[model samples]
Target: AERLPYDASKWEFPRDRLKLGKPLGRGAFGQVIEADAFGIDTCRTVAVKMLTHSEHRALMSELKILIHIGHHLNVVNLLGACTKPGGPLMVIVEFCKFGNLSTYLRSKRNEFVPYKVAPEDLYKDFLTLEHLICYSFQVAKGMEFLASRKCIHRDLAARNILLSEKNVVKICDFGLALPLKWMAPETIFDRVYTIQSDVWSFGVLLWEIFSLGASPYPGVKIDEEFCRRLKEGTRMRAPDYTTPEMYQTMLDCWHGEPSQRPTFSELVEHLGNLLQANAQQDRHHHHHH
Candidate 1:
C-alpha cells in the first residue's frame, strides 16, 4: 500500500493539485472546503479537510482506520490523503452535495410547505414521514456495513451523515470511531463512545431526524438538569409525522438498560423491513392517487 505524504503548506487554497472553492464547514480541528481534484474532468467536488498540527495526529489515526477498512457504499469512501512533514494534513474525500443530515433537516424545516397553518402554530413544521424513514434506513445500512467489518462508528449522529443529490446517505466522520469490543464497559464518565454508546447516539440521531433538527433539551442547560431529565425517563419524543414503528424502534435503542439495546445486525433487519413496507405503501398510494 502506498502511503501519501502530508505537506501543510501544500494545503493552501488554489493549489495546482486542487481547485479550491468556498469553505463548507469549520470545527475545532480545522475547516472543510469544496475543491476539485486534479485529473478529474467532471465537476466531482471533494470535501478537503485541513487539520492543525495537534489535530493532524487524530486525522492520521482516522486515515489509518480508513485504510484498514477500505471502501464501502454505505460508508464514506476515502479517496486519498496528503501529509508533508511540518505541513498541515489534508484529506480528500468524496463530496456530499447535500452536506450532513443536520444541515439537510434544517433546510427541510425552513422550506416547510404545510397545507394549512393555524395561528401561533408550533408543530406545523417538521420532517416528512418519508424523509425520516429514508434517513433511518440509510443509517441502519451504514451501521450494518460497519458492523460486518467489526468496526463501530462511535459518532453516529445527524452531523455525521452526508447526503448526495440523489438523496443517498453516506456515513462520515470517523474521528471517534473504534473497533467493536463486547468486553468494554457500557459507559465512561469521560465520554468514551463504544458500540453500545453508538447505538444510544443513533437513537438520538433518529429523534433529531424525525424532529425539525431540534437539539435535545433545546434551551435547557447541559448540566445536572439535563442529566436529571434523562435519568427520569424523559426523552425527546417523536413528532406526529414519525411512524409508530420508527418511534418504537428509537425507544428500543435507547432503553434504560444498554444491554437491552439492539445490535447493529438487529437494527439492519428491523429497519430493512420497515423501509420495504413503507416503499410498498408509497407505491400503492401513488398508484391510487
Candidate 2:
C-alpha cells in the first residue's frame, strides 16, 4: 500500500521485517502504532511512528536529533527506524503504557481533587503534592539530559510526557510536536528556539503538571492577548497546587530573555533539593501508584 520515495541508504532500517499492529496515536507530524521489529539482534514489540510526508529533508534532521541525543532513562528511548525510497518512513521507540500526563491527571483516576490546586489545598483523591513534585523532577531531569547532550527540544510540555506503571514518567515528542501555549515568547514572536527556550516551555509544563491537566492561559486568546500581554510583562498566575518555591522555579524559566533562564543542570539541582521533601511525602503521603 506504500511506495519507496527516497534514498534511505544514509540511514536505513528493514521495512521487510516489520510486524505492524494497530495505531496507538497520531501527532502533528505522524502516526504512531504498536509494532515489532526483527533486526538481526533486536526483536520485540515497540511503538512505531510514521512520518506521513513522502520526501522532506527534515526527516534527516529528525534522525540526526535522535542520534546525537542517544538514550537516557528520562527521555523516550528510540529503538530503531526504517524508511522506503517510495514511502512509509518510520521511527521506532519504547512505549509507556500509562499514556501522557494530561490524560492521566484529568481522567476519572484523579477523582479526589480539583484538576489544579495550591499548597494547603485538600483533595479527596490520594494523590499527594509530593507525587506531583516527583513528576516535575523527572521531566526536569529529562530536559537536563537533553541539555547536556546539546540537544534542544523545541517542544517540551506536559502532553509530550508519557507515563507507565513501572517508570512513572517519560518525556516524548522530542521533535516538532504539540502545543502553542507551551512555546516560549520568542518562538511565537521571532521563531527563535534554544535550550533556554526549552527552559521557558519547561516553566509552563510545571504549571500543567501541578494543575492536574489544566491548560496554560485557559481563557486568554492566543491570537493577540497572549503575546501582547506577555511582552507587556503579564505572566501566568501560579496554580493553587504550586508552592512559592515551585512557583519561583517556574518563574525562573520565563526570564523574558533566554540567557537569564536557568540551565537544565541548575534546574535539576534545584528540583533535587526539593525532591527530599517529595521523597519524604512519597514515603507517607497518600500519592498514586
Candidate 3:
C-alpha cells in the first residue's frame, strides 16, 4: 500500500458511495471498473480507475493532473476520487458511452459497407463524412483547451480519446506518459513535449480517424532509415478516404520546425470551418427543388 499525497486528501469521496461493477479494462498498472456513484450531486454511472497493483504514484499524479486541469467538455471530466485509509485507491471519472475512439472507429469500419448497410443506417450510426470532420474538429478543440492549461497530453491517440453522448470526443488516460511513430521531428531528436509535440501526435490521430483506426506509417519501421527520412521531411501518405486538403492539415502539424506547426487554436478554426463547409455541402445536395 502507498500513502496518498498529503494534499490529495481533499479530493477524496466516500468509498461506500461507489458500487463497483464490471471491469472496463485491465493492465499491469491496474484496472478501470464501471461503477455507480452516489452522493456526488448526481447519481450516475462512472468509470473508476482502481489501483490494484503498486503503481499508486502514477495514479496519484493522474489524480492531481485531473484536479489541476479541471473540467472541459472535450477532455475527460474528473468526478472525484476515493483514497481512504485501508488500501483501495481510485480515480472516478465520467463514463463515456461510446468507449475509446480507436475501438469505436474500428468497429464502425465493419459496418461501413454500403451494400451491407443502408445509407440511412450509416447516418443513424453517425458515420457521415461530416461526422468524421466533426470528430477531428472536436479533438482540436479539446487540445486547444489542454494547451491553454499548459498540459501536455504526451499520449494523444484515438485509443486515448473517449466518445461520450452526442458523439463528443473526450481525451483521457492521463498517465501523467508508444507514441514513437506519433512523435514530431523535434520530439524525436530531443525529448521536447511542448504543445507543438502534442500537435504532431494529433496529426497522427487524425490519420487514425480518417483511416478508420489504421496504424500510422504503414510499412515504415522505426529505425535509422526512418529517422533519417523523417529528418528529411518525409511524411505519412494520405489515407484512401482523405481529401488533399485534409492531408495538408496533417502535414502542417508535422512541419519540420516545431515553431512552424499550427497551434491547437489555429487547428480549431481550420477544422471547424472545414466541418462547416462539409455540412453545408451535404445540405445543398439534400435540398432538391
lDDT of 2 by residue, 1-289 (tens): 1232333454467777878898877656657788777872368777777763433446545655766666788887776677556556777777677788877877734453423233424554456566678888889899999888777788888878998665468888734432568888788888888898899999998988777788898787777776777877788889867878899998889888788899989988998888786666545543432
Candidate 3 ranges with C-alpha deviation above 4 Å: 1-10, 52-55, 110-123, 174-177
Which ten contiguous residues of candidate 2 have the minimum total lDDT? 1-10
lDDT of 1 by residue, 35-72 (tens): 88875323567877776455666677666667667677
Clashes of 2: 13
TM-score of each: 0.79, 0.80, 0.87
What is candidate 3's lDDT per residue for 1-289, written digit by digit as tens? 0332435555678888889999888877778899999976468999988763337777877777777776888888887887768657788888997888888888887555212123444455547677678889988998999899888888888889988998788888834334678887777788777898999899999999889878889987889788879989888889866767889999898888889999999999999888888867766666641
Provide backbone clash counts, one per model: 8, 13, 0
List lDDT for all candidates, in order.
Answer: 0.68, 0.74, 0.81
lDDT: the better of candidates 1 and 3 = 3
What overall lDDT, based on C-alpha atoms, would model 1 receive against the true structure?
Answer: 0.68
Ranking by lDDT: 3, 2, 1
Q: Lowest-scoring 10 consecutive residues by lDDT in candidate 1?
A: 176-185
Comparing candidate 1 with candidate 2, which one achieves the higher lDDT?
A: 2
Off by over 4 Å in 1: 1-15, 40-43, 52-54, 84-87, 110-128, 174-190
